[PDB]
Symmetry: D3
Subunit: 265 residues, 6 copies
Amino acid sequence: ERNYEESALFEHQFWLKVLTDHAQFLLDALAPKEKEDIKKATYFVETFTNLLNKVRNVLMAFSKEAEQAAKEIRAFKLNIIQKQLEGKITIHFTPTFINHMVNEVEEYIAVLEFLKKGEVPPVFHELHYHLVWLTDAAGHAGSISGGLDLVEKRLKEKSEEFTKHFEQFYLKAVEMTGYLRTELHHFPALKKFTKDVSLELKLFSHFLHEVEELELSNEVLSVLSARMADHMAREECYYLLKLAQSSGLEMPKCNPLEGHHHHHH
Amino acid sequence: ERNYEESALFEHQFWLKVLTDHAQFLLDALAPKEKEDIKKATYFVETFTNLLNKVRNVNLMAFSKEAEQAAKEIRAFKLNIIQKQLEGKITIHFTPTFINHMVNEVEEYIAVLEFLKKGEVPPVFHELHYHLVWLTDAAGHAGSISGGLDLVEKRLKEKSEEFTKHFEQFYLKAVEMTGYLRTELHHFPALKKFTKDVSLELKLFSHFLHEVEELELSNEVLSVLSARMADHMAREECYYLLKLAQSSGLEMPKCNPLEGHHHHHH
Amino acid sequence: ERNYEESALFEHQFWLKVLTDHAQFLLDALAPKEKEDIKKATYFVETFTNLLNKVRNVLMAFSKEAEQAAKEIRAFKLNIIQKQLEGKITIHFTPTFINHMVNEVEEYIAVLEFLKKGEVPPVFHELHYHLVWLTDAAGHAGSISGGLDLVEKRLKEKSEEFTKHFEQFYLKAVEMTGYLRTELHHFPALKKFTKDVSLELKLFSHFLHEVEELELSNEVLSVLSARMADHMAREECYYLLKLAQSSGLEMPKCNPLEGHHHHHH
Amino acid sequence: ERNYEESALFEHQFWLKVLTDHAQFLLDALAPKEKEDIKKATYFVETFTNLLNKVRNVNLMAFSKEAEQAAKEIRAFKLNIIQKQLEGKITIHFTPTFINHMVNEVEEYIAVLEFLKKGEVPPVFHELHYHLVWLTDAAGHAGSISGGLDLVEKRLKEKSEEFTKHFEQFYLKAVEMTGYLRTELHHFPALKKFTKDVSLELKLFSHFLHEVEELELSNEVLSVLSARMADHMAREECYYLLKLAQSSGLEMPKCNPLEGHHHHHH
Amino acid sequence: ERNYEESALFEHQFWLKVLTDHAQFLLDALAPKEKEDIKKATYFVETFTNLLNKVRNVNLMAFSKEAEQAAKEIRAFKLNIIQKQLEGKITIHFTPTFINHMVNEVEEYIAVLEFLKKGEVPPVFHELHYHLVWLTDAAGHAGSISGGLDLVEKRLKEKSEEFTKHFEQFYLKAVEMTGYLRTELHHFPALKKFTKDVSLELKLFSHFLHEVEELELSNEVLSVLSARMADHMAREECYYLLKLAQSSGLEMPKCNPLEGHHHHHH
Amino acid sequence: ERNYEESALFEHQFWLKVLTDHAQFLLDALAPKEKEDIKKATYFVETFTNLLNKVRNVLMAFSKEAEQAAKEIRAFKLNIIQKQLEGKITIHFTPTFINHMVNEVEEYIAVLEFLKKGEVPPVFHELHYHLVWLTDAAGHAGSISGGLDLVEKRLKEKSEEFTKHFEQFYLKAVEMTGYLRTELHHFPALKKFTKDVSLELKLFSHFLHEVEELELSNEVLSVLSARMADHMAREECYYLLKLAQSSGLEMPKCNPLEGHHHHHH
Ligand SMILES: [Fe+3]
Ligand SMILES: [Fe+3]
Ligand SMILES: [Fe+3]
Ligand SMILES: [Fe+3]
Ligand SMILES: [Fe+3]
Ligand SMILES: [Fe+3]
Ligand SMILES: [Fe+3]
Ligand SMILES: [Fe+3]
Ligand SMILES: [Fe+3]
Ligand SMILES: [Fe+3]
Ligand SMILES: [Fe+3]
Ligand SMILES: [Fe+3]
C-alpha cells in the first residue's frame, strides 16, 4: 500500500540522481570548445546535486522547485538536439540517446504533476511503461555496443543481441497498445509479454553489472564508464519495479536509488 | 491545388475499395463454423461494394455520412474479432496484429471523413504522421507474405523477411524523429532524407508485390496468399507513397492507389 | 516382443486420431464458400471419429474398413492439392503441409497392408522413418513459424531453428540411404545420426508442449491451436518410438495416442 | 529430333570423360599407403581414358556393353571405398557423400546404357527426375569448393556456401513437388517456374565455376582444388542444364558438356 | 620516376595534414575536465597546422628534422593517452584501438622521415608492408563509423559493419601470405590477385566515405561523426591505394591523398 | 620453479611428437604421384620417431641433432608451400595449414636456441603465445570445418564458431601488442583477455576430444582422423600451459605430451 511520503522520497531520489547523471554525462560529452553548453551542463550538475542533497520528508513545495529544474534541463537537452539536427554542436552523444534523456525527464515531470499536488503518483497501465522504457533499454544496449573498442567483439555481439530483443519487444508493445481499442485492457498475452520482458531485463541487469565491473577494473576497452553502467542498471531496475507493480508480478531485488559500488558508505 | 470534388472522390474510392477487400479477406479467413461472423463479413462485403460503386459527384457530403456509419461498424467488427482472438473465442486465419492494422486503416478513413462530411478538403498531414501509420502496415504486409508462402518458397521468404526488417527499422527511426519534433523544428534534413529512403524502399516493395501478384495469377507460387491480396497491398503502398510525395515535397509516384493493372473488367 | 492385438489397437488408435485431426484441420481451413469440400471434410471428421470409437480387440475386418476410409481421405487431400496447383480452391493450408498429410495417410496404409492380413506390422529400417518423418517435423516447425503473429519474434526464431535442424537432418538421411548401396545396412554413423535426431525430437516435443500451453492460456498470438500442437507432439512421439525400436534405443516417455490436456478423463 | 548415332556418341563421351575424371580424382585423393586401391584407380584411369577415345560410330551397341561392364566395376569400387570409410578402413581425401554422388552419377550412365545396348535412343526423363539427381550433386559441388578453399579465402567461401544453400533449398522443393505428382498432374505452373529458377541458378553457378577454374589455372586462389575439378563440375552442370531445357521446354544452354574451354589440346 | 622534391613535398603535406587532423580529433574528443591534455592537443593542432603550411621546396632536409621532432612528440602524447585509458585515468571519446591506429600512422611518417632527413627518396615498400599497416586501419575506420552512427541508422551501420568484416578478413589473409614469404618467393600470383581485390574494396569504401561525408555536410545522417573525419579517412585510403598501385604494379588511383573535394577554401 | 632437465625432456617430447605428426600428415596428404616428396615425408617420419625414442636425461648435444632435423623439415614445408604457390604439387593440405606447421617448427627452434646452450627456455610474454597460437587454433577449427562431410552441418557450425572466435581473439592480440609501445607491459585488459582466451581453449579442447571419439568410433563422416584431433588437443594444451605460466593463471589439467587414447600402455 503506497503512501505520499515514501513514494515522494523514492521518486525524488531516483529521478534527481538520474538527472544529475544526465547533466554529468552531457558535460563530459561536449567538446572543450562548447563553452556555453559546458557552463549550462555544469549548472545542471550543481543544481540536481543540490536538490538531491536537500530532499527530505518535509515536500510539496520541494516538488515545485524540482519541477522547474526538470523543465529547464529538458529545454537544454532539446536545444542540444536542435543544434545536432542543424550541424551546430560537437557532442559525443547521438541525437537519439539525448532523445531518450528527454523521454526520461518527461516521466519525472509526469510524476511531479501528482507530487506537487500532494497526491501519490499512480502506477500506470503496464503498457505505458513498456512504451517508454523498451526503446530506452534498446538505446542502452546500443550505446554499449557503440562505446566498445573495435576489438571487443564478444561483448558487442552480446549487447547487439539485447538491442534487438528490446526493439522486438517495443514493436510487440506498440501492437498490443492497439489491441486496447477492444476495451479489453488486460488479457493473457499482455501479462505473458510483461513477464517475458521482465526476464530479459533481469538478464540485461546482470550484463550491465558485469560491464560495470569490467569498467571498474579497466578490464574492458571502451569509452563507457562504470557510472554509466550503474545509471543504466538503476533505470532498468525502476522499470522492473513499475512492471511488477503494474502487472502483479514478484518485486525485483535491486535498488533503483543506488548501485552496489557507486556510493561512499 | 487539391479541390473538394476530386479529393473526396479519390479518398472514397481508395478507402471503400480497401474496406471491401478487408471484409472479403475476413470472410474468407473465418472457419466455416463461425456462422455469425461469416454473416457479418458478408454483410460487410455487400455494404462496401455497394458504397464503392455508389460514390459520385452527386450529394458527396451526405454520402460521407453513410460511408462514415459503415466504417465505424466494420471497425467495431474488427475490434470484436480481435477481442475474441485474445480470449480464444474464434477461429480465423488472420493473426491479431494483421487485423489490428486493418483497424489502423479504417481509422485513417474515419479521420479523412471528418473533413469530407464538413465539405472540406482533408489536409495533407506532416509526413511523420504517414510514417507512423504506414510503416508498421508495410512490415505487416511483408510479414504476412512471408508467413503465407509454402515451406519450400525459401527464396521468396528470404526476400519478404528482408522487407519486413527494413520497414520495422524505418519505423524505429520514425518513432525517434517524432520525438525530435519536441524541439519545435518540424522539418530538418535528416527527416527529408528519411522520407526519400522510405520512398525508395516502397518502390522496391511495390515491384516485389507486383511480382507476387503475377506469380499468384499464374499459379507459379505455392502459398495461401491470393493475387487480390498482393494487389491490395500494392494499392496501399501507392497511397502511402502518394501522401509522402505531397507532404514531403517529392516527385509524385507512378502508380494508381485505386485500381491495379489486373483486377478490373475493362 | 510385439503382438498382433496390441500392435493393431495401438496403430488404429494412433492413426485414426491423426486422420480425425486432419479432417478437422482441413474443415476449419476451408473458406466458407468451399461448400463441396466442407461437406467432404465434415464427412471425414464423422467417419474417422466413428471408426476410432469402434476400435476393439475383436480387427482384421475392421482394418479393411479403416483402409477404405484412409484411401478416401488420401484422394480428398490430393484433390485439394490438385486444385491448389490450378488456383481452384481457397484453403488456409499450403500445398506442402497437405502433401505431408498425404505422406502420413500413406504410412497408415502401409501398416494396414499387414494388419488386414492379421500380421504384426514390422518395425522398418530406421532410415525409412527418417525419410518420412524428418520433412514432416520440418513442416511442423515451419507451420508454427508461419502461424505466429508478426510480433512473436522470439517464438518464430525458435521454430525457424527447428525447421532448419530437421531439414539438415533430412539431407543427411538422404545421403545415408545412398550409403546403403554398399550393402552395409547398419554402421556407426547411422546409429549416431538416429540418436542425434532423437535428442532434437525430444527438444522439439518440449517446444510443442510449451506452445500448446501458450495456446490453451491465450498467451501466444497466432492462428495455431492447442489441438494442432497436441497433434504435432503425438506424431513426434510415434516417430521417436519407431526410432527407439528400429535402432535399439531407450523408449521415449510420451504417449502417441493422447496428450496431457486434450482428453475428457 | 534425337537420333541414335548422335545421342549414343554424346552420352558416351560425356559419361566416359566424367568417369575418367572420377577415377583420376580418387587416384589422387588416396593416401600413398593405400597401394591396392591406388592400383585399382589407376586401372580405372587407364580403362575410361581408353573407352573415352575408343567410342565412335562403329559397333556402338557392342561398345555399350563394354562401357557398361566398366561402369559397374567402377561403381563397385566406389561403393567399396564408401564401405571402408564407414568402417574406418581407408585413408582417402574425399568425404563419403562426395563419393556417394559419384555413385549417383555412374548409375545415371548405367540407366542410359540400358537403352544404348538395345540400340535405342534413351528418352528424356520428366524434369523432376533430373532435379532429384542433380540438385544434391550441385550442392555437393559447391560444398566441396567451400571445403577445399584455404582458411583465408573467405569471400570465395561465402559465395560457394550461398550456392550450396540454394541448391539444398531447391532440392527440398523438388522433393515436395515430386509428391504433388501423386495428384496425377505431372506438369503444372509451379513446376515449370521451379525449373526456370533452377536453370538461372545453374547459369550463375557455371560462371562461378568458370571463375574458379581460371583462378586455379593462374594459381591466384589458395586451395586444394584443381582447375580440372572445376571444369568437371561445369561440364556436369551443363549436362543438367541441357536435360532440363529438353525435358521442361526451355532454351538450350550455351555450354558444352563434353569439353571445357581450357582442358583440350587443339 | 620519383624525385626528391616532389616525393618530399607530397609526403609532408599528406602526413602533416593527417597529424593536424589527429590532434584536432583528440582535442574535440577530450572531456572538458581534461585541461592538461586539452592544452597539449591544442598545441598539437597549432604545431602541425603551422608545419603543414610551412613546408615548401626551400630547406626541405632541415624541414624534415623539425617535422620529425613534432611527430615524435605527438606519438608520445598518443601513447600517453592510451596508457591512461588502460589505467582508467582519462576521459576521452576515442577507444584505445583507434588511438593505437593513430600511432601506427605517425610511425609510418617517421619511417618516411628517416629517408627525407637524409635527402633521399623514400622507397616504395613491398605491397604486403602496406597491407599489414592499412588493412587494420581501414577496418578501424569502418568500425568507427559503425560505432559513431545513431541507434536508428541501421542501414548505414549494416554497410559499415560489412566493410569492417572484409577489411579484417583481408588482414588475416595478408598475415598468412606474409608467412608464405618465408619461402623466399616474394611475388606470386595469389599475392597480386589479393592486392587487386583489396584495391577494389578500397574503391568501394572510398565511395561510401564520400557518401558519408556528404550526409554529414547536409546534416542528413544522425551521428557523432563529422564530415572532416570522413574526408580524413578517404584521404588515407587514397594514400594506401596509391602505394599499392606503385608497389604492386596497378593503375594509379583517381583520388587526391592531400585534399578532399569539400574541405578547402579556393 | 622450472629446471633444465625437466623443461628439456618436456619440450623435446612435446615437439618431436608434433613434428612426427606433421611428417605423417604430410605423407598421407601427398598424392601417390608425388614420389619425391613422399620419400622426403617418410624420411621425416623415421627421423622424428627415432629422435623421440632416443630422448633421455643425458641433452645439450641431443638438442643440436634435434635442431638440424627441425630446420630440415622446416625447409621441406616451405618447399611444399612454394610449389603450392606455383601450381607444382598435389597435396591435400592448404598453404595456410602448412604455413601454420612452419610457425610451429619455428617455435621449437626458438626453444632449441636455449636448450642447446643448456639454458632453461624462458616463459615469453603472454602476447607472444597469443600471436602464435591464436591463428593456429583458428586454422585448427577451420580444418575441422573443411574436413567434415557436407552433411555434418551441426558439427560444421560448431567449428565455424570456434574459427571465428579465435580469429577475433587474434585481432585483439594484434592491437594489444600495439598498446605495449606505451611501455606498460601488463595491464588489466590484457590479463582478462588471456583469461577469456583460456576459457575458449578449454571449450575447444572439449570439442576436439568429442571429435576424436567420433572419429575413433566412425560416428562422424569426414576426412579427418582421430590422430589429427589428438594432435590439435595436445597443441591447445601446450598453449594453455604457456598462458597459465606466462600470465599467472591456474595450470590446465591436460597433457601436451600424450592424449587419453593414442598410446600403447
Ligand atoms: Fe538515463
Ligand atoms: Fe536511459
Ligand atoms: Fe489493408
Ligand atoms: Fe494494409
Ligand atoms: Fe498430421
Ligand atoms: Fe505431421
Ligand atoms: Fe562427377
Ligand atoms: Fe558431380
Ligand atoms: Fe588517421
Ligand atoms: Fe586512419
Ligand atoms: Fe601441429
Ligand atoms: Fe597446429
